[PDB]
A paper describes a structure:
EV71 virions have icosahedral symmetry and a diameter of approximately 30 nm, comprising 60 copies of the four protein subunits VP1 to VP4 (5).
In contrast, D6 destabilizes the capsid only slightly but interferes more potently with the attachment of the virus to the host cells. The cryo-EM structures of E-particle-D6-Fab and E-particle-A9-Fab were determined to overall resolutions of 4.9 Å and 6.8 Å using 1,486 and 1,158 particles, respectively. A total of 60 copies of D6-/A9-Fabs bound to each particle, around the edges of the pentameric building blocks of the virus—specifically, between the 2-fold and 3-fold axes. As with many other neutralizing antibodies, binding of D6/D6-Fab decreases the stability of EV71 F-particles only slightly. Furthermore, D6 seemed more effective at blocking receptor attachment than A9. Neutralization by D6 is mediated by inhibition of EV71 attachment to host cells, possibly via blocking the binding of the virus to the receptor by steric hindrance.
Numbering used by the authors:
A (entry chain D): 1 to 106
B (entry chain A), C (entry chain A): 73 to 210, 218 to 297
D (entry chain B): 82 to 318
E (entry chain C), F (entry chain C): 1 to 239
G (entry chain C): 1 to 49
Amino acid sequence: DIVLTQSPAIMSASPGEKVTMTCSASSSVSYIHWYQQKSGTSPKRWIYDTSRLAFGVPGRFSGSGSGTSYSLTISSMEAEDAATYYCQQWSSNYTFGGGTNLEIKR
Amino acid sequence: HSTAETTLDSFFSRAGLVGEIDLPLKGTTNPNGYANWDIDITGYAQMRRKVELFTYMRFDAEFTFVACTPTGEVVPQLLQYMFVPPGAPKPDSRESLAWQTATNPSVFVKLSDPPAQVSVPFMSPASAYQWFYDGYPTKDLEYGAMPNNMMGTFSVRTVGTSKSKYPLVVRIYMRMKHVRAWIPRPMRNQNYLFKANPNYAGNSIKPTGASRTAITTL
Amino acid sequence: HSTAETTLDSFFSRAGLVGEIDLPLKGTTNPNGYANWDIDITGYAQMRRKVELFTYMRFDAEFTFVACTPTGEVVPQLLQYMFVPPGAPKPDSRESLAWQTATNPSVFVKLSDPPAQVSVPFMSPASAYQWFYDGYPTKDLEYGAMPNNMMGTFSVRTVGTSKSKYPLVVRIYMRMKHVRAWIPRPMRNQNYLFKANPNYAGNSIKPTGASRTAITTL
Amino acid sequence: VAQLTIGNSTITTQEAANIIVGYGEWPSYCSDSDATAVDKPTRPDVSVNRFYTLDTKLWEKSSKGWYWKFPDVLTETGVFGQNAQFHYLYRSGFCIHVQCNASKFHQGALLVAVLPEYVIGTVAGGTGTEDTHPPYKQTQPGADGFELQHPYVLDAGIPISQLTVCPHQWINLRTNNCATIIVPYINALPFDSALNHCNFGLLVVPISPLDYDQGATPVIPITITLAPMCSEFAGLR
Amino acid sequence: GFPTELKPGTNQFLTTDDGVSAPILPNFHPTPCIHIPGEVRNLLELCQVETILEVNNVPTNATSLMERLRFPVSAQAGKGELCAVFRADPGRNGPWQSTLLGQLCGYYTQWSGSLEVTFMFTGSFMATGKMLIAYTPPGGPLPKDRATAMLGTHVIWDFGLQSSVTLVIPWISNTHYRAHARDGVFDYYTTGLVSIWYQTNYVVPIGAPNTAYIIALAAAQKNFTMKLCKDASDILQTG
Amino acid sequence: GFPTELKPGTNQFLTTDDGVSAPILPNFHPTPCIHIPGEVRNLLELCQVETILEVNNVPTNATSLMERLRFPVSAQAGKGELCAVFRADPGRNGPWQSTLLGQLCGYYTQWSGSLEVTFMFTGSFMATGKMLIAYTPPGGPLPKDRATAMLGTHVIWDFGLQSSVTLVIPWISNTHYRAHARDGVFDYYTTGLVSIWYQTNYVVPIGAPNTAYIIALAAAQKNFTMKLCKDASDILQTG
Amino acid sequence: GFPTELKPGTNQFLTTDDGVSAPILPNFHPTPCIHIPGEVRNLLELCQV
């Protein structure tokens, strides 16, 4: 009964510009984690404890947030990043976010 | 083979910045060309946690005064630094008679003259300054209040009947000397919220140190 | 266990402000760029009552001079402080030859130079300064006048043939040293009316201290 | 095994496990050349100094930990609480004894340490912007004690992981059950108030949680017995 | 020359620095100090002197000020009645202000020692009776009645036998700091209390006045001390 | 007067110059130091104290923070399995941050000495088994398996016999300098490693829990030392 | 104080004056000199090679 709302649902970057995806919570939260899911493949690990990066992840990805509003920032954007990004909470009922369809603009 | 650096005195030496007075010409800040600074040794951020390692302490402080204009300029202006011991009345105005009370040590110096410097003794009427007090002074707001830890106030002002012609900035450094400490205690691992009590954020309770994935991975 | 603070010397140390000279440019006050200050130790308000605790006293005085412009500014102006011992003639003008009489100690100093400071001995031809004299000097207006209590005069002036270019303010502090006192007496409990005698207000005769309702209520 | 007695109090305890004399000092008295050499401070020996056995607390799997304040705990209790209250000043040393009673089929580890000037800090609202000061029931719990709510930081923003720096002793169920601690008078003054200032606080927390298979007693009684050492008082009222 | 580095504080004027300065008159030989009776060396000498304590600090009417010095006892007062009361607060307002001790405490910030009050009965020689004088240490509230005060540290005084009696106040300490209004005052709290009750009534034969007064005299023991010179006064040298 | 020439450095303010300055209150006699228990004189006293090492520094969930203090062993773990592992890096992040030693290393730049970890089994009294605890000096990679670790400096621990065991780390030296990013950090490299394997499985009789925890306690030997005061902290006095 | 008169050369910087100056790190105990082979003390040692 702790819901995570992600905005926006769909996004399009140039690329070479920054990208700011948001995960908002209905109640105050301790930390947030992020996954990635390209099509046909399962979710991959991306960011944990809000700001720490999984081994693979490029350094151009960032993480911040405190309390109830957290955000994943990408600068700069490259055609290899286009995936769906979910947030997740670990305080009570382990809930996932709705995801954000990141896409290439042309 | 030597362990001189790990001594108390070695640990607490160094004159740190604990105060900064602003005496602007046009301003909301200290409009009467004077200011009162009750001695707070927490003024040096890093300090609080270092001293709060011990329950009781004792020491002398060497104060050094650095004054200039905001750009760090030197000008022909004379200044009065007044130390009002605890129990003595601080000046309410730029003409309070406190400025002339002999029992309030005062020292004068020109901005040109090198830094002013004086030593202040172990004031406390108690046998030692104590950072923690588990009681009240004879749910309350007087909890953890050991007042007998006051060192005094430092009143600063431009000399003369009239406002100074220049905008001034005084910085107060403090070297702690002849230190003795008792009853060591757990190193603060949570963020400080208030200057008075040890209260912390009951939501944002963080693990003392960096975490990891598994207890089998490095 | 120590009682060093309750000694006479301890009680009377501290250099207090006992004088302030004004040397304005345009003014009604000291129009000739000079001034004569007969040494009055009552200059520090609090003083009178403290000394009037004893009948006889003896001591040396350390004088320290603080000079600046009204805003407490420092300027390139030279000054002459002349001490005219009792019996010596004070200067009637800014060109009186007294200013050059060798037998009148004089000290020169620039406003920039730190405070001037000199010690003055126990003048009095008597064995001790006596605050009370129950007689007349060989209904009268000479009652309670022990003249042999004069310390002397301090004549101040800007150096040079011409008036100074700046408005000046001199402050005189005085630390009493090597003090000895005899015959203690009742602490003045009534307000002072004159610098000479102990006369008080015979209408406004107030009770030494705070009163209360009944002698059975606290 | 043998039983020691101090007046009308007789406790059954083990021969002589390792005792912890806090800071290497023994609770002694205070000589004649002090602050109040006139009001000769009367030192209780008779009943005042004996074995008090506080209301046993029950260890549980979920237990967070407990703490009592001194001398608060006793200022309510008996003829000692008698002196502490109707007297102006107080200085006293303490012998504290903590014991559990558990079958060789229970497991746990309680750290038991004493901390001078134990100043409680509440949560402060939650978000950190409320300057709420701990109540009186939290600052001086009495003889029932009080439960920690944030053991990890000892309800005061300090790692417990470092509490060992204080006079402590361990109680590992699979090795011992009784822990003993001698505490000297510790304060920045010779004497002080017995009702306003709590020189220290007794801490007892489960570092390794209590555990057992279904069927074994689910709660382990922890019994605190304590005795005043070289206790002095001055200025009767 | 000789190598030197000036350190901070150079050129400063400390109003409490007791260094030496140049003698204005080097040749002058000041008239020799001769012997004068009663030289004082340390103020605490004065503090040990008995001064009249204005316990009866109630009349203010200019011509009745002499009345503050003495309070009275009379036949009209019944057994047990509370005659008078006051605190052991040398430096604070009230009764002690009249004593010399009190006035000296004012030029200091802290202090402590045993005090000593002496009572003098100035009634007719033919009068007799008993007064109970009790001291309630700091904290203890003024005893309800004579009997409860009778259980505290007390002294039965029969002015039929001895015209004087001296009570000792074991201890008083103005050490507990207080920052009330916005003006910090190192105050008492140690307001020890001295109550005085008519143990018996005032008894007198025909021909003797049915009222008599008493005088309070106080001083401090040799164990008295003071700390922190603090010049303070309502009386100052007028312009 | 006396000939002198001022040398460079005259009039300067060194924040570390420990010269003397003028006493503001020359007459003041500060309240005497009395005896207080447990005075500390040199920080290295503290470094030799056993503090709980949060080896299990994995849970972050606020209410499971107490779990970092103890890690466990269970029946489910088969012989040879690696129980846990960590480095001998007092000053760096991870487990050591919880120990007091760790926190003190932070106020210093360099250090070296022998360490000492003690393990405490807090399981049921009825349990028994063996744990292999091995130390792989700096450079040596974590041993592949139990057997290869068995060849290194190891200790077989039978908590069936002794509930405690203490391991000594011969040496650790944070002396090798590193200028990575653009921020120079005098780092370890001496990351000695301590591995712990289930020599045998966890054995227990009916009636005893099939899991037990262990507590790590560390301190440094008397040969420990530190150099270069360096104040650093994430926790500071808030505005 | 103590009477003094400053003489010419006061406040000057001689690049060859071998006086003493204030130690920046008073508490620092520099790592001890150990024995190293072939120490040279006076250049003329080299000239004889």
